[PDB]
Design a binder for this molecule. Structure first.
Ligand code: HEM
Ligand code: HEM
Lengths: 362, 362
């Protein structure tokens, strides 16, 4: 129920322990007024400071003038902060506005088309994103709802995705969660304590070429549908062969324990772990931070199920792209389809109470 | 930790309200009564394992490598999480298996209500399973595995995820708020009120349908809220719609949440005044609904609301009179009923040899 500090050299919500729930929103910008957008970023930052401390936005949820709408919509009253983090990112399309063309980071690369992609353009892209993570879904929805309200007339929600449970880990001391295929997902990630690895693989540095992004990161989001009918009729051995880890313990094939190091040559050549491992990708390493989803039925008698894959990295071109390119032959591809995609530049942290989201850019 | 599965009544009605819901409606594809009975027995056996935190069948791993696992594995390592699984039978089931003369009279078709905009695809269903647990992955796992066991005999027609409070951070005695920011559940039937349950919730043998003794009747309504319209209303308008204040949730003119309402102080079309038993000839409901937030629609609006669940001894004397009385509810401006279903929820599974539906099928 505790608060996660909002201020820092980096935004929270990346290296932070992974919270139970996600509400991710992508927004498009509808104002051409730079000043008006800056004013919004400042108002959003002020709101975020309140929300992440478990306080209502503005002048509160009640006790104001009866004839005015409340400043806060009120559905989080009486709730703890619930480890809420709010992480903002800027999409490539933002940089066509407000005289920002020359400030688009090279590391903010458009993704190439990957074999098997079936991207819904309506649930892809976005000028900006807010990732709300919390242990309480109500706290996360409240945050997104109030941000959108504050932004009325300046931004619209383009698409959103709720995640009912995590399928990632930045805390190797704690139990690794399972995805909806039944496997542990997050064993070999980057932990929030691994400062050297975060600097090497996750945080943008000044020397990378875009000074305003120093201390930020780059985010890839992929909405991935899972073919659970197809998966659920596969044998145990087929499932384990797909990954290169056993299902029960999640140990690498041949070994006894989850956290024993993979011996890649014992895996099938098309095993997911083998193809995704840094050693198979010239050292490319990602911070994975995704969540599971189910959005009803598919209209053909089955549950809908998928994984909202999020990865943070220092450079999209040296993180997600190489690794996804190497998954072209993945055995897992029989059972998944990417159906939504977005990339974002996640700026540096809000340093103190006078700072604001995007201040280094604007 | 866990809730007993066996009882005179099914669990999940009068037992403590858990933090999360996965509700699924199923349609039956087989015409063979014997095949359906066999399915009910297999599902009962699965439910016994699931509610005790155990995998279905021979487990999620460690069986024959060349066989699909009996349990899909995504709840391994999780706790029982107070899982309850409650089954119900829709009116349409009774057109199968020679059952037409065993449809309870209390399982009434709902009339059309003013302002209904029901999606046929998220309405009805031959049967339902209500899965409630504190961990949504435990609930989803239960539905996913029941659906799998049933493949070839049943299909999933529609599915809804929902959330109430998060118990780890929110005291049990605090009333949850709905997404309109009002406390929701103050004046309800509590599972401690054994006589009120007998009067208003459980079917009695003398009511007309012996197989349903100890069962109940369920109305499910998917109710969208027009969030962005509501959030533009003044605080006064919002309070006037309900007849309670927003901060404390006290009836107008009173000081505390649990102060008994004075109906005449409320506006004539206030929700509480219209829905109160005194306004409806004494009609009283067990509400056990959950909030939902599914995402955003094509206009960028929040697809959110209340998945309303009411249990009652007879649909004709519970939901129908109360909902009829809400014809002029001030709340109607901000809500729309977009899905509907009714179910007969049979008596409890008495012991280890009993099975869901045994009083009906014989
Ligand atoms: C639905 C899609 C996916 C599923 C079900 C899935 C599942 C898994 C599982 C079970 C593991 C092993 C445990 C672990 O170390 O985390 C794993 C590892 C990994 N996955 Fe995936 N994954 C998916 C998509 C992706 C994608 C899209 C990428 C990157 C483009 C990726 C990158 C990785 C990486 C880097 C590892 C760790 C490999 C290592 O260093 O040992 N995964 N995944
Ligand atoms: C989105 C839709 C709805 C919302 C937001 C809503 C909200 C509320 C709220 C805030 C209260 C007062 C606190 C409480 O006693 O729980 C209440 C009471 C109640 N509601 Fe609703 N409600 C909705 C729909 C319905 C429907 C469809 C029915 C029945 C057909 C219903 C029946 C009741 C009853 C019986 C009470 C208790 C009245 C009393 O005895 O004081 N509600 N509702």
């Amino acid at each position: 129920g505790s608060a996660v500090p909002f201020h820092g050299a980096h935004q929270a919500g990346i290296a932070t322990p992974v919270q139970d729930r996600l509400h991710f929103a992508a927004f498009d910008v509808t104002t051409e007024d730079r000043a008006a957008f800056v004013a919004l970023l400042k108002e959003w930052t002020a709101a975020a400071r309140r929300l992440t401390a478990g306080h209502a936005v503005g002048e509160g949820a009640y006790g104001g003038l009866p004839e005015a709408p409340p400043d806060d919509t009120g559905e989080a009253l009486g709730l703890k902060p619930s480890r809420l983090t709010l992480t903002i990112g800027f999409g490539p399309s933002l940089f066509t506005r407000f005289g920002l063309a020359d400030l688009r980071p090279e590391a903010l690369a458009d993704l190439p088309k990957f074999p098997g992609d079936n991207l819904d353009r309506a649930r892809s892209g976005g000028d900006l994103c807010v990732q709300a993570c919390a242990d309480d879904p109500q706290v996360a929805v409240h945050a997104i709802r109030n941000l959108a309200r504050i932004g009325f007339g300046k931004v619209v929600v383009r698409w959103s995705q709720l995640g009912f449970g995590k399928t990632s880990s930045t805390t190797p001391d704690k139990q690794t969660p399972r995805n909806l295929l039944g496997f542990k997902d997050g064993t070999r990630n980057i932990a929030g304590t691994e400062k050297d690895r975060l600097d090497r693989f996750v945080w943008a540095a000044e020397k990378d070429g875009t000074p305003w992004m120093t201390g930020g990161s780059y985010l890839v989001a992929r909405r991935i549908r899972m073919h659970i009918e197809t998966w659920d009729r596969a044998s145990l051995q087929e499932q384990e062969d797909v990954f290169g880890r056993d299902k029960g313990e999640g140990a690498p094939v041949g070994k006894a324990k989850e956290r024993d190091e993979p011996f890649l040559k014992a895996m099938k050549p098309d095993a997911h772990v083998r193809l995704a491992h840094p050693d198979s990708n010239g050292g490319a390493t990602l911070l994975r931070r995704g969540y599971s989803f189910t959005d009803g039925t598919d209209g053909l008698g089955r549950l809908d199920a998928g994984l909202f894959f999020l990865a943070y990295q220092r450079d999209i071109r040296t993180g997600f792209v190489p690794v996804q390119r190497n998954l072209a032959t993945d055995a897992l591809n029989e059972f998944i389809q990417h159906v939504g995609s977005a990339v974002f530049a996640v700026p540096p942290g809000v340093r103190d109470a006078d700072d604001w989201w995007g201040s280094t850019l604007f």
